[PDB]
Amino acid sequence: QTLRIGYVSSLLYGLLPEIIYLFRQQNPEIHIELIECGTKDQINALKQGKIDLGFGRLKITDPAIRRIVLHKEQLKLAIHKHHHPNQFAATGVHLSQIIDEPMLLYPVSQKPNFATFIQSLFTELGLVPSKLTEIREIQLALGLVAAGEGVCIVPASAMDIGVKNLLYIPILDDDAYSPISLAVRNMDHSNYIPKILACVQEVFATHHIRPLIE
Amino acid sequence: QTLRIGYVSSLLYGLLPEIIYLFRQQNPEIHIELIECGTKDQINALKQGKIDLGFGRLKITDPAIRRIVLHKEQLKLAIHKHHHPNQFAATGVHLSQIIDEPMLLYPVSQKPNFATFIQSLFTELGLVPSKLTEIREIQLALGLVAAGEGVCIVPASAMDIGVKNLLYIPILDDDAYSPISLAVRNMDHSNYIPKILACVQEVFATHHIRPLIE
Ligand SMILES: [Cl-]
Ligand SMILES: [Cl-]
């Protein structure tokens, strides 16, 4: 049997690869195909049987799809380490403090996506970012911050991406988090679902994190 | 005036963003456009005036293009930290030791590219890698190593990419390095060329590295 798992790349800096690695060692018989797939696109891919599991980073719902929320990652503002030493405290900023700053969004894809999500955080607060640029993928955006192209809001795990000379400052607003979720077809009764969820639990426990399931 | 700079993303984990940042602060008047462009594609882009500077990671020559070699990055084998504890010594491996291992190449693009370069290192030694898979971009490949998909040869600066649970082992063969080079049109006499080269020198000196120029 072949298990097709959709994922977004920003999740590769967190616990997901560990989870897949553990699943694989526990289930060596199963052939695993990892497939890069945007969060919205995972819905249709699941429906059409092109993937069996979808790991995504923003909330999208569908009646045919069960969304299993694993964890909420706090958002951070990535800045060049010498950018605004006084007005951007290391203890954190509110989104209201950064509307004047050149801001990098990601990815470049058909919307809705993480770029529209981040924009919505401002919109629901009645804030308007003054300059937005859409960048292909998160790692590029962080590279461009270091090169002097402004600021970029990222999930906590992106703090470890190896771009030099950055600081990652907490975003203080309540709604500023990215949910890590696992999507599956509602009428899929395969044993790989409880098996992968068991692996999620083992890895989270290893790291002293309680997942939002159980 | 607008300065168009081509780059490959793997260079964002090294000194390049610092260099661009310094250039920018020293030359605030100049508008800078950073453009993602493969190393071979930078040749034609320079010729057609679509970029003015091309930062690449493999050796490609053209009579109309001046190639300025800045630095040579040693290659490393990225492995899951528990993969072959005895046969892959942390002190280093020869390419001959890894031909049986599932190997991830990158990027997926029209050849020649870094994937064909890495393949050529084996070929010139009379070695044949048993299983090669081409992956879209370096960060994905490293994520897939962590998830259990095998091994991946990367430049030294990619050791800092934030994928968890990897080890990066020296490749011992003499030809196993990636040259960082700056490409320009031979008949381009703009002052941004000596200016960016001066910035390269300042940043390298900051890091106690002697560049291969001067
Ligand atoms: Cl992205
Ligand atoms: Cl790449």
Experiment used for this model: X-ray
Between the CA of residue B165 and those of A14, A65, A124, B96, what are the distances in Å? 10, 32, 38, 24
**Contact A34/B at CB under 8 A:** yes
| Nearest one of B27, B32, B46, B22 to B2, comparing CA atoms | B32
Question: Is residue B101 a contact partner of residue B151, using CB atoms and an 8 Å limit?
Answer: yes
Burial B65-98 (b: 16+ CB within 10 A, else e): bbbbebbebebbbbbbeebeeeebeeebbebebb
How remote is the CA of residue A106 from the centroid of ligand 1, in Å? 5
3-state secondary structure of A7: strand
Test the A interface: residue of B13, B83, B160 with most A CBs within 10 Å: B13
Between the CA of residue A161 and those of A111, B127, B173, what are the distances in Å? 25, 33, 28
Number of H helices and number of E strands within chain B?
A: 5, 9
Residue A141 φ then ψ, to 5°: -55, -45
Breaks in chain A follow which residues, C to N over 2.5 Å? Answer: none
Q: Which residues contact B95 (CB under 8 A, 6 or more apart)?
A: B121, B122, B125, B127, B171, B173, B176
Cβ neighbours of A13 in B, within 8 Å = 143, 162-164
Strand partners, A53: A5
**Contact A36/B at CB under 8 A:** yes
| Nearest one of A167, A16, A157 to A74, comparing CA atoms | A157
Could you give the count of Cα atoms lying within 13 Å of A72 in the half-sphere of its Cβ?
A: 7
Cβ of B143 within 8 Å of Cβ of A12? The answer is yes
Continuous segment of H or E residues that includes residue A151: strand A151-155
In angstroms, the CA B11 to CA B30 distance is 22
Question: Is residue B75 a contact partner of residue B159, using CB atoms and an 8 Å limit?
Answer: no
Handedness of CA B31, B34, B37, B38 (dihedral sign): positive
Strand partners, A76: A154, A170
User: For residue B140, which ligand has an atom nearest its CA?
Assistant: 2
In angstroms, the CA B213 to CA A5 distance is 47
Which value in Å is the resolution of this experimental model?
A: 1.9
Name the burial class of residue A191, with classes exposed (0-12), middle (13-18) and buried (19+) by CB atoms within 10 angstroms of its CB. Answer: exposed
Between the CA of residue A188 and those of A180, A194, B63, B200, what are the distances in Å? 20, 11, 60, 56
Cβ neighbours of A73 in B, within 8 Å = none
For tokens 């907490």, what's the residue?
Answer: A170
In angstroms, the CA A9 to CA A57 distance is 10
Question: Is residue B195 a contact partner of residue B23, using CB atoms and an 8 Å limit?
Answer: yes
Structure tokens at A194: 């409880």
Q: Kindly list the structural domains of chain B, giving each domain's residue range(s) and its CATH number in brackets, ordered by start.
A: 1-72+180-214 (3.40.190.10), 73-179 (3.40.190.10)
Cβ neighbours of A25 in B, within 8 Å = 148
Q: How far is CA B4 from the centre of its chain?
A: 19
For tokens 């780059």, what's the residue?
Answer: B7
Question: Is residue A92 a contact partner of residue A172, using CB atoms and an 8 Å limit?
Answer: yes
Handedness of CA B111, B112, B116, B120 (dihedral sign): positive
